[PDB]
Design a protein around this ligand. Structure first.
Ligand code: NA
Length: 636
DNA sequence: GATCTGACGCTACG
DNA sequence: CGTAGCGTCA
């Protein structure tokens, strides 16, 4: 009533007073209101409606009486986002004051609490439009209770606001988040918005307290929170793709698919669903009985084992590959398109490993290596990453963390031989020197295939699981791969020692911790079932490495983003992050100056205090550049 | 009839 | 190990 005001209808003196209130505010509590009107506080993942406006609660306390006279205390202000039916000058004015207020929200010195902060920051960033760049939201820090709850319990599915209230909030606080226009009135909706914003503040404070109790607070403030505006920028941008070339490629792969289907039907001597694993299993073992020769599944390991026994496995392999490419990396990528470009949706709450996840399309899972197709009705090379092209004039600048998992494992284990390997620098093709040291065969004899074996051999180690894939990915029988693994294991003892320490810690504390303090509770480490316990054990050792590497990647992301954020020259925009790799879109003449800053910043992550972290191994960064994500020539 | 849906296989990425 | 996404089938 007097607690809720549309800022468009304020008198100008009241507008100025409002700006000053925002500057002097103790805290700001924010939520997005949709056209329902519902909020982020209600229960939907998708609100199935457009953003209408933004509601901000301005808290004068977290000293003395205050009478503004144009509002009560503490007031809720409403900022219209959604465009009117007709654009005119008054809309321009409204937009001007709105932009001023929202920016005041972005740069204010008080705590800002928002349930989903990335959404808010994205909305605001798009609302600025031409009046603002991505660097305006760069310094924003929202307090996101969902990210807090995630840091505490990363396993649990992403809870609603109400769930978080019933869980971390004490006590007997009941909220009504489900009001909309038409199930209720405007006054009910608004009243509930105000009350629930207060509750949201309370909850956020409690969750901060908990984060301090579990020792997650420094991680929260410094890693997760500053990452929020960075995801919003990436979602606001778009990467241009080629619709035509993709349609052609789609048609071609369709043709080849038809060919392989006909072949498969021919050599199995029956007509069966080519995309059915059940039928293929029945065929492979049911009839041909290839397993008795020299039921098991249809996985690539099995099929690579049988490749010499019969034609069908090789056919199924090629078909599976081509079908994957066409279907996910061409046809599915066209469905994500808007206006000739695509933009992935990022999720910070996605994993238990602390890694980011991406959607629509999944840009982290796009095949790195191009494939070859025996063109049906010349050879044909197909690179899905070549479909991603930079704007003009602009060019992609990639920064990779070289052997990051291996270096993390070296740090954690402290193995003398690996540490000796990395601290002679660069002398890279580190996997070659590793092959030589491991296999005791001197350096030159080491070939590219041995480098590959070494890398596969490593990754299989760091990640695990293991004998089976290693074999499938390496192109060698399972037993040979397992032998390689065991050799590698007794060559470096401190790795087994490290895993053993990690499992012991997991049994002791009931949960395992990464480098920067990210925690992975694993209650099944205390389980009586042996496969569950052994699973938990397998999960801990993985979480240490994967979690640590995720921490480092996020940290690099933040530091580079911040470095470019304050530069009066560089316009370089962070486009994507695929795990170990950062993908930037940089204006051409800025390439040399930008690559320098990126390299220098990421390599400076070896020692960053606080965080406490210091590394026993230096971080080598590999820079690349090119007009297409598919073709990137090495740089420097 | 005709679609649809939850549960599982497979394997790209790291 | 653990993400997304595309595919069956009862
Ligand atoms: Na008006």
């Amino acid at each position: 009533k007097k607690h809720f005001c549309d800022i468009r209808h304020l008198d100008d003196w009241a507008k100025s007073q409002l700006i000053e209130m925002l500057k002097q505010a103790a805290a700001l509590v924010i939520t997005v209101m949709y056209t329902d009107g519902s909020t982020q506080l209600g229960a939907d993942q998708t609100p199935v409606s457009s953003v209408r406006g933004i509601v901000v609660l301005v808290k004068r306390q977290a000293c003395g009486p205050v009478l503004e006279g144009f509002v009560s205390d503490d007031p809720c202000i409403y900022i219209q986002i959604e465009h009117s039916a007709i654009w005119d000058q008054e809309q321009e004015a409204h937009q001007q004051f709105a932009r001023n207020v929202l920016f005041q929200t972005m740069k204010c010195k008080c705590p800002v609490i928002c349930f989903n902060a990335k959404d808010f920051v994205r909305i605001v960033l798009q609302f600025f439009g031409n009046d603002g760049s991505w660097k305006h939201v760069a310094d924003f820090i929202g307090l996101d209770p969902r990210i807090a709850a995630w840091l505490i319990d990363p396993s649990d599915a992403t809870p609603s606001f109400e769930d978080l209230v019933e869980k971390y909030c004490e006590k007997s606080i009941t909220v009504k988040v489900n009001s909309t226009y038409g199930n209720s009135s405007r006054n009910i909706v608004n009243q509930n918005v105000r009350e629930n914003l207060k509750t949201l503040y309370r909850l956020t404070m409690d969750l901060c307290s908990k984060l301090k109790d579990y020792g997650l607070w420094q991680l929260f403030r410094t890693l997760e929170l500053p990452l929020i505006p960075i995801l919003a920028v990436m979602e606001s941008h778009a990467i241009q793709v080629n619709k035509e070339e993709m349609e052609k490629t789609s048609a071609l792969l369709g043709a080849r698919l038809k060919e392989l289907e006909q072949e498969a039907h021919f050599v199995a001597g029956e007509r069966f669903l080519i995309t059915s694993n059940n039928q293929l299993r029945e065929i492979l073992f049911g009839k041909l009985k290839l397993h008795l020769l020299s039921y098991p599944s249809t996985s690539e390991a099995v099929l690579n084992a049988l490749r010499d026994l019969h034609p069908l496995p090789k056919i199924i392999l090629e078909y599976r590959q081509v079908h994957k490419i066409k279907s996910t990396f061409v046809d599915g990528l066209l469905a994500c398109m808007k206006k000739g470009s695509i933009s992935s949706t990022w999720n910070q709450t996605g994993t238990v490993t602390g890694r980011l996840s991406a959607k629509h399309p999944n840009i982290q899972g796009i095949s790195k290596h191009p494939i070859q197709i025996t063109t049906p009705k010349k050879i044909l090379t197909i690179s899905p990453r070549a479909m991603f092209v930079s704007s003009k004039g602009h060019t992609f600048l990639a920064a990779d963390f070289s052997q990051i998992e291996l270096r993390i494992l070296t740090h954690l284990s402290g193995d003398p031989e690996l540490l000796k390997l990395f601290q002679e620098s660069e002398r890279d093709d580190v996997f070659s020197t590793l092959t030589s040291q491991w296999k005791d065969v001197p350096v030159e004899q080491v070939t590219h295939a041995d480098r590959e074996q070494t890398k596969k051999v490593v990754y299989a180690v760091v990640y695990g699981a293991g004998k089976e894939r290693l074999a499938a990915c390496l192109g060698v029988p399972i037993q040979e791969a397992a032998q390689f693994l065991e050799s590698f294991l007794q060559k470096y003892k401190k790795i087994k020692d490290f895993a053993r320490a990690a499992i012991a810690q997991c049994h002791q504390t009931g949960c395992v911790v990464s480098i920067m303090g990210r925690r992975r509770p694993l209650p099944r480490i205390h389980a009586h079932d042996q496969q569950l316990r052994a699973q938990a054990e397998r999960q801990a050792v993985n979480f240490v490495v994967q979690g640590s590497a995720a921490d480092l990647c996020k940290l690099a992301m933040i530091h580079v983003f911040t470095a470019v954020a304050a530069s009066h020259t560089l316009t370089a925009r962070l486009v994507a992050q695929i795990h170990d790799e950062l993908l930037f879109e940089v204006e051409d003449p800025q390439i040399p100056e930008c690559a320098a800053l990126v390299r220098r910043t990421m390599e400076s992550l070896e020692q960053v205090q606080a965080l406490e972290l210091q590394l026993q191994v230096p971080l080598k960064v590999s820079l690349s550049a090119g007009r297409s994500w598919g073709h990137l020539v090495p740089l420097q």
